[PDB]
Amino acid sequence: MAITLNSGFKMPVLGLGVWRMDRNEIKNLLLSAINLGYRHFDCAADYKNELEVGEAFKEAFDTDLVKREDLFITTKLWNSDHGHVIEACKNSLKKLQLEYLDLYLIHFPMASKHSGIGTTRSILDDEGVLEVDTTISLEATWHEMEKLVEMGLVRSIGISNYDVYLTRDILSYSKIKPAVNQIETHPYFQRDSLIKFCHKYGIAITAHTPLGGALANTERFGSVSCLDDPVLKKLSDKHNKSPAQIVLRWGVQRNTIVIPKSSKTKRLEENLNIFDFELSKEDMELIKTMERNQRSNTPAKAWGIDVYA
Amino acid sequence: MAITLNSGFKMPVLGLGVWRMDRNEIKNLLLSAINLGYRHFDCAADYKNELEVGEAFKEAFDTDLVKREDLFITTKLWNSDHGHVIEACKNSLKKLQLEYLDLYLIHFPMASKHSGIGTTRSILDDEGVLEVDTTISLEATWHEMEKLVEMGLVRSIGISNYDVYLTRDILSYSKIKPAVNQIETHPYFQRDSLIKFCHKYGIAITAHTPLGGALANTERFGSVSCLDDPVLKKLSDKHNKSPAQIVLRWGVQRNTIVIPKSSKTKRLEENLNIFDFELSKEDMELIKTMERNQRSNTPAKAWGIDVYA
Numbered sequence A, B: 001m002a003i004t005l006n007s008g009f010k011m012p013v014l015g016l017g018v019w020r021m022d023r024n025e026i027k028n029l030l031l032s033a034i035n036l037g038y039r040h041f042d043c044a045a046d047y048k049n050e051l052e053v054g055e056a057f058k059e060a061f062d063t064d065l066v067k068r069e070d071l072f073i074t075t076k077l078w079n080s081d082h083g084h085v086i087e088a089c090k091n092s093l094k095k096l097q098l099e100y101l102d103l104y105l106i107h108f109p110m111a112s113k114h115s116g117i118g119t120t121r122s123i124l125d126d127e128g129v130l131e132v133d134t135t136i137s138l139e140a141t142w143h144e145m146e147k148l149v150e151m152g153l154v155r156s157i158g159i160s161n162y163d164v165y166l167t168r169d170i171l172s173y174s175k176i177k178p179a180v181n182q183i184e185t186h187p188y189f190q191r192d193s194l195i196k197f198c199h200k201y202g203i204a205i206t207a208h209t210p211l212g213g214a215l216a217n218t219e220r221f222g223s224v225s226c227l228d229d230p231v232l233k234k235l236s237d238k239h240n241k242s243p244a245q246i247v248l249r250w251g252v253q254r255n256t257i258v259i260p261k262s263s264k265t266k267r268l269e270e271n272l273n274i275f276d277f278e279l280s281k282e283d284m285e286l287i288k289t290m291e292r293n294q295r296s297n298t299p300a301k302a303w304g305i306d307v308y309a
C-alpha cells in the first residue's frame, strides 16, 4: 500500500533506509531488497553512500529487475548545503545516476558551514562545537527547494525533523507546501501531537528510526530498544509475527510511512512481510501504553550542541 | 547590576514577573517592589493585567516614587496578534499608560487565530485544539517588530521560548538582531547548549520560571520544585541565604537575567537581596549536578497540542 501525497504522487508506506549500511554491501543489499519487493528507498547526501546506491539502481534497471518509474527514491539536503540547494540536488542526482528524485528533503532545520558540493560535513569549531550558519534562513532554503520542482529535478519536496513550531512556520511561508515531514517516531516516542498537526494540514509523516533503532541506537545513543517489550511479545505470539513486524504494522496503521533499515536480507524480507495480517483496535490501544516520549536519535554529541535543549 | 543588550540599553539582571498576580493585588505589589528597589518588570498582554500594571506605574510616577527612565518595562506580543504587531504594541502601550517600551517580545514562536486587539486569547476549535494560524511566518512578525524600533515605540525587541533552531533562523533573517531570548531555565532545566548558543551571538538570556515555578507549577504543571533539593539545603546553611536566594544568585552568575514572581512583599524583599553574597566555583558546580533537563512550564494542556512533542 501507499499514501497519496499532497503533490499527487503515491509514496509506498514501507521503504528501506540506508543509513549505516556497510558500503561494500549496499549494492547486494539494495538489489536483494528490490528483488524482494522494496520500491521506496530512503537515502541522504550525508550518508555518503549515494554512489553505491546509484550503482545498485543502475544494475537493477540493466537486469530488468525493476523500472525507474516503479521506484520511489528519496534523498536529503545536508545542513552544510542550505545555501547551495540547486547544486546539492544536482550532485545527489549525479551520484545516484538519476534524472529526477521522487522526494527531496531538508535533512534538518539546521544550517552549518558549507563544506563543498558532493562532500558534506558537520564542521566543528576549535572548541568542538558545530560551526552554525546564521546567514541562510529555512525559508530561503525552502524557496530553492521549490525551484527544483519547477525545473523538473524533483517531484515532491519536504522536510525532516521539523517540530510543531517549525512546521507551522513553513506552512506559513511556503508556496509549495511540504509533502512529507520525516521524523523519528516509534512505540517509545509516539509523538501524537506532531503527527496529528502534520496530518491536519495534509503533510505526510515518514517515521524514521521506526523500530526505535534497536541495538544500533542502544550502542550509539544509549536508547532503550522497544523490541523486547512484553507488549510486543504478547502481540508477536498472537499474530505469529516478530516484534519488529508488529511495530512496522503499527506504524502503517497509524497512517505513517515507515522506513526500517536492516543489513540482513533475512530481515529485509521479514520487515516487508507485514501486509498479510492486521492489528486490532485493542492491539493498537495496547501499543499506545508503550509511549515514553523518549527520543532515541540525537546529534547532540556529534555536533557538540544539544539542539533539543 | 544590569546586562548591556546588543541594542546598547542596560537591562537589570533581577526583575519582577507578574504572571498569575491577582488583579486585586498587582498594584500594591508593584508599588511595594518599586519601594524595595525593583526597576525591571516583566509583563505580557496575555497576563490580562496590563491595565492594573499601568495604574501602579502611573501612581509611582505621579508621586515621584521613581522616574520612567529608571524603569525597565517588558511586555509581549501574544500568539493571537502575530498579524497585528504594531496595533497590539500600541494597545499594550495604552493599557500600560506608556509612551515607549524598553523591551517588546514575541511571546511564543506560535501564531494562532486573531481574537481582537486588547483581547488576546488562545482560540480553541470544537475538539479543544488551538486554532493555529498558518499564514503569518515568524519572520514576517519580526519585520513588524523591527518597525516598532524605528517608530520609537520600543527601545529593544526580542523573542521568547525560541529554541536553538528557531534562534538560528531569526539570526539569519533579522535585520535588527533580537536583544533578548526569554526562556525557561532554572536548576532542574539548565539548558546549557541554548544559553551558550544565544550568548555566542550576543543575545541576552532572561530566565523565566527562574525558581522552577515552586508549588504553583507543581499544582499547575506537575513539576518538581527544586527548592527542597538537598544541594540547595547545604548551600543555604553555608551562605545563610534561602534556597530561593541561592537559585536566583546562581542565575545571575550564569550571566542571565532572572525574573521571579512573588505575591508576598517579604519574598519580594528576599528575592531582591541577592547582591550581598556570591556562590563559589564549587557552589556552582554543585548546582550543576541538579540538572535533570526537565521543563516545568508547558502550554500543552492550554492549547491541546504538545508543542514539545
Ligand SMILES: NC(=O)c1ccc[n+]([C@@H]2O[C@H](COP(=O)([O-])OP(=O)(O)OC[C@H]3O[C@@H](n4cnc5c(N)ncnc54)[C@H](OP(=O)(O)O)[C@@H]3O)[C@@H](O)[C@H]2O)c1
Residues within 6 Å of the ligand: A016, A017, A018, A019, A020, A042, A043, A107, A160, A161, A182, A207, A208, A209, A210, A211, A212, A213, A214, A215, A216, A217, A227, A242, A244, A245, A259, A260, A261, A262, A263, A264, A267, A270, A271, A297
Ligand atoms: N531524517 C533523519 O534525521 C533520520 C534519522 C535517523 C534515521 N533516518 C532514516 O531512517 C532509516 C531507519 O532508521 P534507523 O536505521 O536509524 O533505525 P531503525 O530502522 O529503527 O532500526 C535499525 C536497527 O534495527 C535492526 N533491525 C532491523 N530490522 C530488524 C528486525 N526485523 N528484527 C530485529 N532487528 C532489526 C537493524 O539491525 P541489522 O541491520 O543488523 O538488521 C538496525 O540495527 C535510516 O536508515 C535512515 O534512512 C533518518
Ligand SMILES: NC(=O)c1ccc[n+]([C@@H]2O[C@H](COP(=O)([O-])OP(=O)(O)OC[C@H]3O[C@@H](n4cnc5c(N)ncnc54)[C@H](OP(=O)(O)O)[C@@H]3O)[C@@H](O)[C@H]2O)c1
Residues within 6 Å of the ligand: B016, B017, B018, B019, B020, B042, B043, B107, B160, B161, B182, B183, B207, B208, B209, B210, B211, B212, B213, B214, B215, B216, B217, B227, B242, B244, B245, B259, B260, B261, B262, B263, B264, B267, B270, B271, B297
Ligand atoms: N515567556 C514565557 O513564556 C513565560 C513563562 C513563564 C513565566 N514567565 C515570566 O516569568 C515570571 C516568573 O515565572 P513564574 O512566576 O511562572 O515562576 P517562578 O518565578 O519560577 O516561581 C514563582 C513561584 O515561586 C514562589 N516564590 C517566589 N519567591 C519565593 C521564595 N523566596 N521562596 C519560596 N517561594 C517563592 C511564588 O509563590 P508566591 O507568589 O506565593 O510567593 C510562586 O508560586 C512570570 O511571572 C512571568 O513574568 C514567562
Ligand SMILES: O=C(O)[C@@H](O)[C@@H](O)[C@H](O)[C@H](O)CO
Residues within 6 Å of the ligand: A019, A044, A046, A047, A297, A299
Ligand atoms: O540518519 C540520519 O539521517 C541521521 O542519523 C543523521 O544525523 C546522520 O547520522 C548523519 O547524516 C550521519 O553523518
Ligand SMILES: O=C(O)[C@@H](O)[C@@H](O)[C@H](O)[C@H](O)CO
Residues within 6 Å of the ligand: B019, B044, B046, B047, B297, B299
Ligand atoms: O507566563 C507566561 O508567559 C506563560 O505561562 C504563558 O503561557 C501564560 O500561561 C499565558 O499567557 C496566560 O494566559
